[PDB]
Every structure is written in structure tokens, then in C-alpha cells.
Design a protein around this ligand. Structure first.
Ligand SMILES: *[C@@H]1O[C@H](CO)[C@@H](O[C@@H]2O[C@H](CO)[C@@H](O)[C@H](O)[C@H]2NC(C)=O)[C@H](O)[C@H]1NC(C)=O
Ligand SMILES: *[C@@H]1O[C@H](CO)[C@@H](O[C@@H]2O[C@H](CO)[C@@H](O)[C@H](O)[C@H]2NC(C)=O)[C@H](O)[C@H]1NC(C)=O
Ligand SMILES: *[C@@H]1O[C@H](CO)[C@@H](O[C@@H]2O[C@H](CO)[C@@H](O)[C@H](O)[C@H]2NC(C)=O)[C@H](O)[C@H]1NC(C)=O
Ligand SMILES: *[C@@H]1O[C@H](CO)[C@@H](O[C@@H]2O[C@H](CO)[C@@H](O)[C@H](O)[C@H]2NC(C)=O)[C@H](O)[C@H]1NC(C)=O
Ligand SMILES: CC(=O)N[C@@H]1[C@@H](O)[C@H](O)[C@@H](CO)O[C@H]1O
Ligand SMILES: *[C@@H]1O[C@H](CO)[C@@H](O)[C@H](O)[C@H]1NC(C)=O
Ligand SMILES: *[C@@H]1O[C@H](CO)[C@@H](O)[C@H](O)[C@H]1NC(C)=O
Ligand SMILES: *[C@@H]1O[C@H](CO)[C@@H](O)[C@H](O)[C@H]1NC(C)=O
Lengths: 47, 119, 117, 49
């Protein structure tokens, strides 16, 4: 609806609830799967 | 992912990190050491293009890494940031290298004072 | 070698999270890695202390952290919340309660005496 | 990833000594790593078995 321009944002802001006698420990977990792709070869050419 | 901030108090069981955290009394919000680091370093159809990221934006990535680490160690890089007191963070780190964790807890002041001079 | 034929501790080398395992797939002129990772979830906050005093001696955990649920203190492992009672088989002794900053009073239970009535 | 977001056991990858922790700093067109290490001192000799 219009090419708008803006100053990109670096990400959601978040404060860690730090104190001198507080800790946070997980009580559950998930198993994640992610992909990574890597090239290994090109076509062999001859002139 | 997120831009972390340190708490106002800025007193982590002694350890004094003021030389690596941003200086609030500056337009650039660089650290004292970053200010030194940047103080040491058109033609006939030629042009220089600007970077996509300004150096203010890079400083914001660095302060987020510093605030994440000092408050949650390495947990925020694998999931949610989990707070733990910093003195306890240092004790786990000695354990990872094969030193028994009482070496820090009984000598906390010595290690913090020696660190502060070494930095 | 390091992601498929073994388990790596290198951060972000074998995916995001804690590396468990990886499976290769063939792609044209390339390789695809399926990275299986461990991600913690649903944290709660607790009060903690580095050591516990009992009989005038400082007790430190063998592995884990001391936590408090509001009224009682427990030992937990660091990666999953699973509390157990603080005993003499869970902890070790080193030094006195005069050098540790933030040490707290609690009871460390000895299994020997209630066996001997 | 390996020096700042975690603790490494790789020798000499994160400074000289036993790696404890590292702090990044921004430099123009580059990065500076402040490496914190554990160095033993003042050895004595003993007999062992
Ligand atoms: C940990 O998380 C899983 C979900 O990711 C929980 O399992 C679900 O539990 C609800 C009941 O609370 C069931 O209705 C769902 O069918 C469960 N999901 C699966 C996939 O089995 C699990 O209970 C959580 N653990 C705790 C202690 O809260
Ligand atoms: C952290 O260290 C800085 C110095 O690197 C301390 O700031 C200096 O403190 C001395 C007194 O100890 C003053 O004479 C200097 O003028 C201070 N420098 C600046 C730039 O203000 C700072 O107080 C230390 N923080 C803590 C909590 O001890
Ligand atoms: C902290 O956990 C304990 C143990 O679950 C709770 O204390 C009670 O402990 C007695 C044994 O000494 C049990 O018979 C009760 O069932 C426990 N009550 C509950 C509600 O679990 C204690 O309540 C917990 N503290 C808080 C603040 O939740
Ligand atoms: C933890 O328990 C010890 C032992 O009971 C306490 O040490 C006592 O401290 C009081 C002062 O608070 C002294 O009058 C006693 O002489 C001490 N007893 C002994 C045997 O030395 C200690 O104070 C307790 N800690 C807290 C925070 O209450
Ligand atoms: C000191 C601190 O960060 N406290 C936060 C609070 O600001 C926030 O509203 C609450 C819920 O998200 O979590 C906690
Ligand atoms: C833990 O407490 C802090 C405030 O001290 C709060 O910001 C945070 O959200 C709490 N964490 C959980 C899981 O409730
Ligand atoms: C933590 O800091 C508060 C002040 O913010 C202080 O009252 C308390 O005693 C401190 N705890 C420890 C263990 O030093
Ligand atoms: C240990 O003894 C050897 C000789 O056997 C000596 O050369 C060395 O300096 C001694 N180390 C210390 C710390 O005294």
C-alpha cells in the first residue's frame, strides 16, 4: 500500500530477571530438528 | 534473538565490568575500551557504498551478548535465558576445567579483586 | 565426522540447542544435515545458595544446585528440575562456614542414625 | 559461538590457559575478544604412587 521506509529494529527487547539469590531451572523440554545445507561439488568442464 | 539489558544496580558480587559495558554518558553508548578501539584505525567513476548496519547497531548486538552472558551464562544460546547468580556462574566454570567448586566460594573476594586489576 | 559419527560439544556447530544426534541426506551436489537438539522449556525461578551449613561445617553439592521452594531447600540437577533431599551421600564437605559468602543454614540428613534408631 | 556463548575445551582456541569465559568488544571492521583464562601457579613437588 506504499513502499515505506524505516529504521530496522534489531529484535525483541528483553530484560533478564537477575538478582543476587535467584535462579531459573527448566521443568520440561522439547526435541527440535533443524536443517543445514552445504555444497560439495561443481560440474567439471573442459574447453 | 532479543536485546538484553543489565539491571540498573550493576553490581555482580564484586566483579566490576564497567570497562566493557556501555557508558550511559555518551551519545554513542560505546564502552570505554571500544572508544579506544575506534581511535587507532570519490574519483573518476569510483564510489564507496555505505554498510547496511551502522556501528550503533553493532554496539547493540555486543551489549546484548554481554548482558545475556553476565546474567545467564550460556543458557540463553540454547533456549530461554535462565538467571543464576554470577558468583555461581564462575564456580560452574571452574568445575568445567576440573577444579573443585569450593575454590571459588571460599576465595570469592580474591578472584574478583584479581580479575578487576587484570582486566 | 563430528556431527554424524559422534556427539559434539562445539556450540552451534551441529545445530541450535544441545546436540543429541544428526542424520545425513543426499542432495544434488551437496549434503543436508538433519540436526537433532535438546532445548529446555518452561522455567521456574527459585532462591539458591552456594553451600549449606551443618554442624558448623560447609557442605557443597557434588553435582547440582541448591534451590528453595519457599519453605524447604532441595538439591537439583542443573538441566532438569528434579529435587532430592540433601544428605551426606549427595554432598561433600570442604572448609568451614566463615569463608563462603551467602551460605545458609539448613539440615543435612545422615542415613546412618535412623537406621540405628 | 564457542568462546562467548559457551565454554570450550579446544586448546588455544579461546586464549592461553584454561578457558573460563570471554567478552566481545566491537572494533571498526572487526571484533576483539577478551579471553579470561585459568593459569596455575606456584608448584611444589611430591612423591606419588
Ligand atoms: C511437558 O510437555 C508436554 C507437552 O509438550 C506435556 O505433555 C502433554 O500433557 C498434556 C496434559 O498436561 C496432555 O494432554 C498432552 O497429550 C501431552 N502431550 C504429549 C505429546 O504427550 C507434559 O505433560 C509436560 N510435563 C509437565 C511436567 O508439565
Ligand atoms: C569499577 O571500576 C572503575 C574504574 O575502572 C571505578 O571507577 C573509578 O573509581 C575511582 C575510585 O575507586 C575513581 O577515582 C574514578 O574516578 C572512577 N572512574 C570513573 C570513570 O568514574 C568504579 O567505581 C568501579 N565500580 C565499582 C562498583 O567498584
Ligand atoms: C515446598 O515443598 C514441600 C514438600 O512438598 C511442601 O511442604 C510440605 O511438606 C510435608 C512434609 O514435610 C508434606 O507432607 C506436605 O504435603 C508438603 N506440602 C505441600 C503443599 O507440598 C511445601 O508446602 C512447599 N512450599 C511451598 C511454598 O510450596
Ligand atoms: C546459622 O546457624 C549458626 C549456628 O546456630 C548461627 O551461628 C550463631 O550465630 C549467633 C548470632 O546470629 C551467635 O550468637 C551464635 O553464637 C552462633 N552459634 C554458633 C554455634 O556459633 C548463625 O548465625 C546462623 N545463621 C543465620 C543467618 O541465622
Ligand atoms: C525485575 C523484572 O524483570 N521483573 C519482571 C517484570 O518486569 C515482568 O512484568 C514480569 C512478567 O513478565 O516478569 C518479571
Ligand atoms: C521470575 O521472576 C522474575 C522477576 O523477579 C520475572 O520477571 C520472571 O518472569 C519470573 N520467571 C517465571 C518463569 O515466572
Ligand atoms: C542482595 O542485594 C540486596 C540489596 O539489593 C541485599 O539486601 C541482600 O543482602 C543481597 N544478598 C546477598 C546474599 O548479598
Ligand atoms: C622439584 O625438584 C626438582 C629436582 O628434583 C627441582 O629441579 C624443581 O625446581 C623442584 N620444584 C620446586 C617447585 O621446587
Amino acid at each position: 500500500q506504499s513502499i515505506i521506509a524505516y529504521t530496522m529494529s534489531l529484535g525483541a527487547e528483553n530484560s533478564v530477571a537477575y538478582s543476587n539469590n535467584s535462579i531459573a531451572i527448566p521443568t520440561n523440554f522439547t526435541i527440535s530438528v533443524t536443517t543445514e545445507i552445504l555444497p560439495v561439488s561443481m560440474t567439471k568442464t573442459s574447453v | 534473538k532479543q536485546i538484553y539489558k543489565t539491571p540498573p544496580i550493576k553490581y555482580f558480587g564484586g566483579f566490576n565490568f564497567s570497562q566493557i559495558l556501555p557508558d550511559p554518558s555518551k551519545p554513542s553508548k560505546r564502552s570505554p575500551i571500544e572508544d579506544l578501539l575506534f581511535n587507532k584505525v570519490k574519483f573518476n567513476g569510483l564510489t564507496v557504498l555505505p554498510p547496511l548496519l551502522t556501528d550503533e547497531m553493532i554496539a547493540q548486538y555486543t551489549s546484548a551478548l554481554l548482558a545475556g552472558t553476565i546474567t545467564s551464562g550460556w543458557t540463553f544460546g540454547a533456549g530461554p535465558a535462565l538467571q543464576i547468580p554470577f558468583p555461581m556462574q564462575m564456580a560452574y566454570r571452574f568445575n568445567g576445567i576440573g577444579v573443585t567448586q569450593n575454590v571459588l566460594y571460599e576465595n570469592q573476594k580474591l578472584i574478583a579483586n584479581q580479575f578487576n586489576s587484570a582486566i | 565426522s563430528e556431527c554424524v559419527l559422534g556427539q559434539s560439544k562445539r556450540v552451534d556447530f551441529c545445530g541450535k540447542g544441545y546436540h543429541l544426534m544428526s542424520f545425513p541426506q543426499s542432495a544434488p551436489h551437496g549434503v543436508v544435515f538433519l540436526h537433532v537438539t535438546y532445548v529446555p522449556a518452561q522455567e521456574k525461578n527459585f532462591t539458591t545458595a552456594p553451600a549449606i551449613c551443618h554442624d558448623g561445617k560447609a557442605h557443597f553439592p557434588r553435582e547440582g544446585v541448591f534451590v528453595s521452594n519457599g519453605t524447604h531447600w532441595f538439591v537439583t540437577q542443573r538441566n532438569f528440575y528434579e529435587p532430592q533431599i540433601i544428605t551426606t551421600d549427595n554432598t561433600f564437605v570442604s572448609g568451614n562456614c566463615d569463608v563462603v559468602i551467602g551460605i545458609v543454614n539448613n539440615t543435612v540428613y545422615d542415613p546412618l542414625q535412623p537406621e540405628l534408631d
